[PDB]
C-alpha cells in the first residue's frame, strides 16, 4: 500500500498571494514506459464533493483555470496556487493511481484576513423546551476573525463550565470569517433557581470581554 | 450534464448489510469505469471499490479493508452502479461517493454522496425549538439520531445571513443550531420560518420564529 504524506497540514495565506503545498509518495509513481507520474490533485470545498484539479502530476483537468500548477516527479510533487482567492478555501488531497488508489491526509487552506469582532447574541430557553423539563441557553457568536475565541457562561456571576456544547463553522467562502454557537443545557429546576445569564466572549478584537446577558 | 445520484444510505446495525445505488446520467455509462470512494466522519477520503467496463470484462478491484465483504456491480442498460455491503462494521460509517473514473486518466465526476451510519443505537426524531430574541433569530435542532438533518429558512428564500453549525454528538444524541440575520424591518412583519427535515425518521417541521 503506497502511503502519501502531505504538508503543511494547514496553510493560511492572504488573498492575491501564491501558495505552495507538498505531497510525498512512499513509492515512486513515475511509470518507466509512458514516463507519466500517476499523481492527481483534488480539493473539497466545505460541504461539497471533491473536484479534480490535476492529473498525471501536471495536466490541469478540463475547465480548471491556469492558476493551478502541478509539478514534481518520482516521489515528490507540489501544487501551486497563484492569486489565491476567497473561493479557494478547502482541503487539497493528492491521490495516487500507480497501483489501486490512495489519497493523502489533505492540506487545509485558510484565508488570512482583517480582524473582525464577533456579533454576540444570547437566547433564553423556549417555552416549548421548558415544558419538556429542560432548558438550553444558546449563544451565537458570528462573523469573527481570527478563529480563536474564548466563551464563558456565567450564571448570576459564577462560571458554569459543565454542560456546554461549542461548535464552530468552517471559514466562510465569501467574507472569510468564522462563527460559533455555545449551548448551555440545564434542567427546568436549575433554570428556575437562577436569574441573570451571561455569555462572555474574549477575543483579540477587544480590550474587554463581550458580555451578552438576560435576567430571567 | 453528467449526473451521478446515489441513494440508499442510512442507519444499520453492526454485522448488518446495506446496498447503495448510483444513477448515472449525461455520459456513456457503458464505456466508463466506475468507483466508490468514502469519507469517514471528519476524515479524509478512502477509495473503496472499482468496476471496469465490459470491454475489460467487468474487472473489479477492492481496497484491502473492504475486500470479500463488499460487492461492486453495475447495470450498463440502466446506468446503475451498486455497492452491496455485508458484515458491516462501525469503521464503514461515513459518506459514500459515486465516482466516474476513466481508466488511464483520473476520477472525473463524483456524486453528492449518501450517508451510512453503523451503530446499534436507534432512530430518534429531533426536537426543534424556536430561538427568538438587523436582528438575529435562531433555531435549535437537538436530540436526534442519526445524522444528517437538513435545515433551511423560509423553504429557501433565506440563504444569506444563515449559519448552520455542524452537529455535535453528546450522550448518544446530536444537537445542532442554525442562525439567521434579517433586517429589523422584515420581522415580526414578515414571517420567518425554520424548516427542519430528518430523513431517518421521515420528519419535517416548519417552526415559525414568532414573537
Amino acid at each position: 500500500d503506497i502511503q502519501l504524506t502531505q504538508s503543511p497540514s494547514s496553510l493560511a495565506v492572504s488573498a492575491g498571494e501564491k501558495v505552495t503545498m507538498n505531497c510525498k509518495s512512499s513509492q515512486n509513481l513515475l511509470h518507466s514506459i509512458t514516463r507519466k507520474n500517476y499523481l492527481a490533485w483534488y480539493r473539497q470545498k466545505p460541504g461539497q464533493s471533491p473536484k479534480l484539479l490535476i492529473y498525471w502530476a501536471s495536466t490541469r483537468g478540463s475547465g480548471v483555470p491556469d492558476r493551478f500548477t502541478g509539478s514534481g516527479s518520482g516521489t515528490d510533487f507540489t501544487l501551486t496556487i497563484s492569486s489565491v482567492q476567497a473561493e479557494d478555501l478547502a482541503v487539497y488531497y493528492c491521490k495516487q493511481s500507480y497501483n489501486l488508489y490512495t489519497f493523502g491526509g489533505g492540506t487545509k487552506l485558510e484565508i488570512k484576513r482583517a480582524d473582525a469582532a464577533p456579533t454576540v447574541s444570547i437566547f433564553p430557553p423556549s417555552s416549548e423546551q421548558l415544558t419538556s423539563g429542560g432548558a438550553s441557553v444558546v449563544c451565537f457568536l458570528n462573523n469573527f476573525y481570527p478563529k480563536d475565541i474564548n466563551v464563558k457562561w456565567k450564571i448570576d456571576g459564577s462560571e458554569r463550565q459543565n454542560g456546554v456544547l461549542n461548535s464552530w463553522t468552517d471559514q466562510d467562502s465569501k467574507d472569510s470569517t468564522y462563527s460559533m454557537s455555545s449551548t448551555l443545557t440545564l434542567t427546568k429546576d436549575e433554570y428556575e433557581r437562577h436569574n441573570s445569564y451571561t455569555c462572555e466572549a474574549t477575543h483579540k478584537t477587544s480590550t474587554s470581554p463581550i458580555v451578552k446577558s438576560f435576567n430571567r | 450534464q453528467v449526473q451521478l445520484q446515489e441513494s440508499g444510505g442510512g442507519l444499520v446495525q453492526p454485522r448488518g448489510s446495506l446496498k447503495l445505488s448510483c444513477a448515472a446520467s449525461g455520459f456513456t455509462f457503458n464505456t466508463d469505469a466506475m468507483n466508490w470512494v468514502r469519507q469517514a466522519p471528519g476524515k479524509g477520503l478512502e477509495w473503496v471499490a472499482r468496476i471496469r467496463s465490459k470491454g475489460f470484462n467487468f474487472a473489479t478491484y477492492y481496497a484491502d479493508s473492504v475486500r470479500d465483504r463488499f460487492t461492486i456491480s453495475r447495470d450498463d442498460s440502466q446506468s446503475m452502479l451498486y455497492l452491496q455491503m455485508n458484515n458491516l462494521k462501525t469503521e464503514d460509517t461515513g459518506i459514500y461517493y459515486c465516482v466516474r473514473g476513466r481508466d488511464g486518466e483520473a476520477m472525473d465526476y463524483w456524486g453528492q454522496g449518501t450517508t451510512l451510519t453503523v451503530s446499534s443505537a436507534k432512530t430518534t426524531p429531533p426536537s426543534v425549538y424556536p430561538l427568538a430574541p438587523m436582528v438575529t433569530l435562531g433555531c435549535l435542532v437537538k436530540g436526534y439520531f442519526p445524522e444528517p438533518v437538513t435545515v433551511t429558512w423560509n423553504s429557501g428564500s433565506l440563504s444569506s445571513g444563515v449559519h448552520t453549525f455542524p452537529a455535535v454528538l453528546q450522550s448518544d444524541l446530536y444537537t445542532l443550531s442554525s442562525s439567521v440575520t434579517v433586517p429589523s424591518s422584515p420581522r415580526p412583519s414578515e414571517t420567518v420560518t425554520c424548516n427542519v427535515a430528518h430523513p431517518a425518521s421521515s420528519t419535517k417541521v416548519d417552526k415559525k420564529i414568532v414573537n
Binding site: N99 | R52, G55, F56, N57, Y61
Partner: peptide, 11 residues
C-alpha cells in the same frame, strides 16, 4: 486488461 494500469481493451 488484467492489470490495474491497463488502458487497451480486450474481451
Amino acid at each position: 486488461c488484467k492489470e490495474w494500469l491497463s488502458t487497451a481493451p480486450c474481451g
